[PDB]
Every structure is written in C-alpha cells, then in structure tokens.
Ligand SMILES: CC(C)(COP(=O)(O)O)[C@@H](O)C(=O)NCCC(=O)NCc1ccc2c(c1)OCO2
Ligand SMILES: CC(C)(COP(=O)(O)O)[C@@H](O)C(=O)NCCC(=O)NCc1ccc2c(c1)OCO2
Ligand SMILES: Nc1ncnc2c1ncn2[C@@H]1O[C@H](COP(=O)(O)OP(=O)(O)O)[C@@H](O)[C@H]1O
Ligand SMILES: Nc1ncnc2c1ncn2[C@@H]1O[C@H](COP(=O)(O)OP(=O)(O)O)[C@@H](O)[C@H]1O
Ligand SMILES: [Mg+2]
C-alpha cells in the first residue's frame with residue numbers, strides 16, 4: 171500500500187488509496203520521521219527501493235520487499251509517460267538525483283549506460299561552498315536570475331574575430347571567464363547560476379552522447395534536482411534541443427522509483 | 443620555421459632549428475610579448491593555429507598561414523605518438539585545454555565526437571572562487587595533497603550496509619558530502635582537490651563513453667591542464683583503467699597543435 175524510494179537526499183513516498191496517489195517527500199536526514207509516520211498508518215506491506223531502503227526495513231516491523239532502483243525507476247517512469255500521453259518507442263532517461271544515472275530504454279527494458287557525479291548533490295554542496303546557503307529553496311531561488319557572463323567563457327571569447335570551428339555561443343569553459351573578471355563582484359546569485367549551469371551542461375552532454383550511441387532521439391529527464399529549479403530545466407532543455415534531441419519532463423517524475431516499487435511488488439506475484 | 447598554437451589560455455610555440463624542437467609557452471594574456479619575441483627572430487613564415495592565431499597574424503608583418511586546430515592537434519599528436527613508440531590503430535584523444543574537446547581517430551583522420559566545458563579553465567576559475575589563488579603553480583601545488591573525503595559523496599555512503607548496484611567506492615556526487623560535514627574545515631587544499639576531481643571525472647567519463655561508442659580501447663590525453671597537476675593525471679588514469687580502457691599521456695602533448703601546424707604547412711605544398 172506504500173511505495174518508498176529512500177534516496178541519498180530525499181525519501182519519496184507514494185501512498186495509494188482508492189486508485190489515487192498521494193505524494194510525500196521527507197529528507198533522508200530525517201529517515202526516523204518516516205518510520206514515525208509509518209508507525210501511525212495501517213500499512214500491511216512496504217514496497218522499498220533506493221540506497222536507504224535497508225535502513226527503513228530494519229527499523230520497522232511491517233513486512234517489506236526491496237527492489238533495485240534502476241528497474242523500479244524505469245518501470246514507474248514507463249507508467250507515468252503513458253499516463254501523460256507519451257508513447258515512446260525508446261529513449262534515454264537521465265535520473266538527476268543526488269548524483270546522475272543514465273539509462274537506455276529499448277521499448278522493453280532498461281540498461282544503465284553511464285553515470286556522473288554532477289547532479290543535485292553538487293548543486294547543494296558546491297552551492298554551499300560559494301554562498302554559505304544551506305536551505306534548498308533559498309539556494310535555488312537565489313540562483314534563478316544569476317548572470318553567468320563574467321564567470322563562463324564562450325567559444326567566441328577564445329576565437330574573437332575568427333569564425334570558430336564550432337558555434338561561437340557555446341560554453342567553452344565553465345568558470346573560464348573568472349580570471350578575466352578578477353575585479354568583478356562575484357555575487358552569490360551569479361556564482362550559483364554558474365554551478366547550476368555546469369551541472370546542467372554536463373548531464374545534458376552525457377545524455378545526448380548516449381542518445382547518439384544507442385540511436386534514440388528521445389531523452390526523458392527525472393529527479394528531484396529539477397524541483398524549484400527552472401534555470402536547470404532550461405539549461406538542460408535548451409542544449410538537448412540544440413543537439414537535435416527531444417527533451418521530456420514528467421509530472422511527478424521524481425516519484426518514478428516509488429511508483430515502480432509498488433507496481434513491481436504487485437506483479438512479483440505469479441506462478442508457473 | 444615556427445609553429446604557434448595560440449589557445450584560450452596559453453600560447454604554445456615550437457621553434458625548429460637543425461632538426462630539433464625548442465618548446466616555449468607564454469600566457470595568451472601576454473600575446474603582445476609573443477609578437478615582441480617574433481619581431482626579434484629571423485622567421486620567414488608563421489604556421490598558426492588556435493583561437494588567437496588571427497590576433498598574431500594581424501599584428502605582425504611576417505607571412506602567416508592558419509590551420510584549424512582539430513586537424514593540427516590530431517596531426518601533431520600522431521607524430522608524437524610514433525616518435526614515442528606508440529603505433530595505435532585507433533584512439534579517442536581528449537584535448538584538455540581551457541575547455542575539453544574529444545576526438546575519434548580511426549587510423550587516418552580525426553572527427554570531433556564531443557566536448558565539455560570542464561577543463562583547465564574551470565580548474566583555475568572555480569579554484570580562484572574557492573581559494574582566492576590566481577597563480578597557477580600555487581593553485582595546483584596546493585591541490586595535490588587535498589583530501590576530498592568530506593566534500594565528495596560515494597555510492598557506499600548512500601547504500602550503507604546494502605550491497606550497491608554499482609561499485610561502492612565510485613563517486614556518487616561531487617561535492618555531495620559537504621552538507622554532511624557542515625562543521626568541517628573546508629580547507630583550500632581540500633576544496634581544490636575536489637575541483638580537480640570533478641573536472642577529471644567528467645573528462646574521463648566522456649572519453650570512456652565515446653571510446654565505447656566508437657569501439658576503441660585507447661584514450662590519449664593531451665593539453666596543458668596536466669602540467670604541474672599529478673592529481674589530475676591520476677584521477678584520469680585511474681578511472682580510465684577502471685572502465686577497461688588504456689590511457690596514454692604524451693611527452694610534450696600540449697604542443698601537438700603547434701607541431702601539427704608546422705607539419706601541415708610543409709605538406710600543403712604540392713601540385714597535380
Ligand atoms: C549512485 C546512484 C545510483 C544513487 O542514486 P540516487 O542518486 O537516486 O540516490 C546515483 O547517484 C549515481 O548513479 N551516481 C553517479 C555514479 C557514477 O556513475 N559516477 C561516475 C564516476 C566517474 C568518475 C569516477 C567515479 C565515478 O569514481 C571515481 O572516478
Ligand atoms: C572551444 C575549444 C575548441 C577551444 O580550444 P582550446 O580549449 O584549445 O582553446 C575547446 O575549449 C572546447 O572544445 N571546449 C568545449 C566546447 C563544448 O563542446 N562545450 C559543450 C557544451 C555543453 C553544454 C552547453 C554548451 C556547450 O553551451 C550551452 O550548453
Ligand atoms: N526539499 C528539498 N531538499 C533538498 N533537496 C532538494 C529538495 N527538493 C529538491 N531537491 C534537489 O533534488 C536532489 C535530490 O534528487 P532525488 O531525485 O530526490 O535524489 P535521491 O534519490 O538521491 O534522493 C537534491 O540533491 C537537491 O538538489
Ligand atoms: N603556466 C600556466 N599558466 C596558466 N595555466 C596553465 C599553465 N600551465 C598549465 N596550465 C593549465 O592548462 C590550461 C590550458 O591548457 P591548454 O592546452 O594550453 O589550453 P588552450 O589551448 O586553451 O590555451 C589552463 O587552463 C591551466 O589549467
Ligand atoms: Mg534517487
């Protein structure tokens with residue numbers, strides 16, 4: 171009756187009652203408060219996934235079954251895409267969580283085709299180092315209207331009056347313009363926009379590269395890293411389109427794993 | 443008689459006299475001092491490449507021919523590999539300059555197969571933001587013995603007592619451990635090691651991904667970003683090996699473009 175994806179930073183909960191979902195999030199830091207909540211419900215089985223699933227299972231007396239997050243994510247995302255009118259033959263999905271995991275879905279199953287440590291954790295952690303802000307809403311709100319111009323170097327900055335070998339407006343070097351602007355006021359907003367910029371550019375670069383390798387035009391982006399971060403969504407969407415791919419975002423995409431755990435548990439029951 | 447690769451951060455000069463090379467570097471910031479030097483030599487032709495080639499050409503009266511850096515880099519690197527006893531049938535080369543450009547060499551010619559703004563410029567620029575150090579030797583020396591443990595999150599930190607779906611020692615999130623260590627002394631050395639860490643991990647991830655796509659085990663790493671940066675070299679080499687590829691570094695690899703410009707100019711002369 172409950173699906174829980176207990177990830178590196180957020181615990182995603184999907185409560186099912188009367189054929190409708192109720193979505194909840196809690197910080198993984200507060201995992202004990204998830205157990206508290208569970209102990210006040212009338213749940214007969216936990217469908218778990220994610221790195222911290224074992225911690226919940228070992229701290230509560232409710233029967234639990236654990237599912238590997240890659241398969242749970244892929245299944246929940248498949249459900250959400252169909253619910254939302256997308257009938258895709260294949261796609262890359264990039265799960266931009268605490269870190270970023272990349273998968274190719276061929277129409278039937280997923281395989282992991284790469285990963286990178288540039289994701290939501292870097293946004294928070296490097297963000298804190300450059301701004302001293304710990305609150306996620308404060309951090310991301312501050313970043314939205316930051317100006318990356320004095321921090322990031324573009325191809326045209328290097329090639330100047332010469333026509334460049336690749337488009338001039340492309341980022342050549344994240345943070346590569348800093349040393350050209352050493353008298354600049356590197357504001358917290360500007361610095362944080364550059365952090366979101368580099369995370370978005372790296373994720374998208376990897377996603378479009380495996381899209382080419384596995385011969386799909388479709389890239390689906392999920393993960394809580396996009397929550398309250400319109401800038402990140404735009405950086406990713408824009409570059410995806412520029413490189414000839416189609417980006418998709420999913421309503422409640424961050425809950426793919428939790429939805430997938432519930433579904434996998436259902437269909438685990440069979441016999442031969 | 444002179445090959446010059448005038449890049450985003452360094453100007454690489456190869457002087458040829460009596461069948462032996464003389465290598466020089468100057469900061470692109472100091473491009474006027476390269477023109478000064480040129481005006482004191484007895485050079486009859488400049489073989490130029492790189493983003494700032496046009497600037498040198500327009501500020502001096504010596505005849506000049508310009509070559510596209512991707513082809514000049516590939517050619518000079520081919521020469522250097524053979525000089526150094528490597529006879530490779532194919533390879534990826536990653537040019538880790540101010541930014542990073544990735545190429546597949548099939549045995550005959552190169553094509554660019556990707557790029558990313560994580561490279562030497564980010565090391566300097568983000569390094570400056572986290573440390574206030576502008577001097578490259580100071581910056582990189584400070585980073586060498588930094589401890590990334592309190593800054594970077596590993597897969598085992600998320601999965602804890604549960605066997606993880608990918609190896610536990612892998613970086614899950616660059617800077618992802620910062621919020622778990624908010625009372626930590628984030629020393630300049632530690633912060634800079636993490637900057638070098640993320641740049642190395644992203645470059646290597648992209649290089650091994652295009653190596654798989656283009657079916658080669660060989661990855662050659664060039665660029666001045668490796669100079670005075672043993673940590674970067676190690677981060678890259680280690681992960682390359684872990685992902686089943688063979689890393690190569692090249693003596694004077696940073697001068698590939700300059701060597702290639704000289705060679706291309708030579709052989710541009712022909713007729714039909
Ligand atoms: C670990 C995962 C699956 C946990 O999922 P969550 O993010 O949903 O909690 C996720 O964060 C992830 O896939 N992270 C990226 C892991 C990865 O592929 N790293 C790449 C990498 C690249 C280079 C490296 C390195 C690791 O170790 C040393 O050098
Ligand atoms: C521009 C180049 C060729 C100049 O050579 P140098 O570094 O030798 O001076 C080199 O720095 C390079 O290839 N840089 C990386 C360029 C790149 O591929 N960027 C990727 C990228 C990724 C995402 C982006 C984006 C650009 O613009 C907006 O979103
Ligand atoms: N309320 C929040 N608190 C903290 N981080 C948040 C919040 N909402 C979104 N995020 C972002 O989402 C990231 C986690 O994404 P998620 O897909 O839940 O990863 P995981 O499965 O690793 O928990 C965080 O690192 C952060 O960037
Ligand atoms: N003496 C130096 N001064 C500045 N940067 C240096 C120096 N030596 C090495 N570097 C590093 O090398 C990077 C530039 O590499 P390079 O291959 O020369 O790029 P480009 O062709 O863009 O000039 C710098 O961003 C820096 O990280
Ligand atoms: Mg997750």
Ligand SMILES: [Mg+2]
Nearest residue numbers: 449450539540
């Ligand atoms: Mg260069």
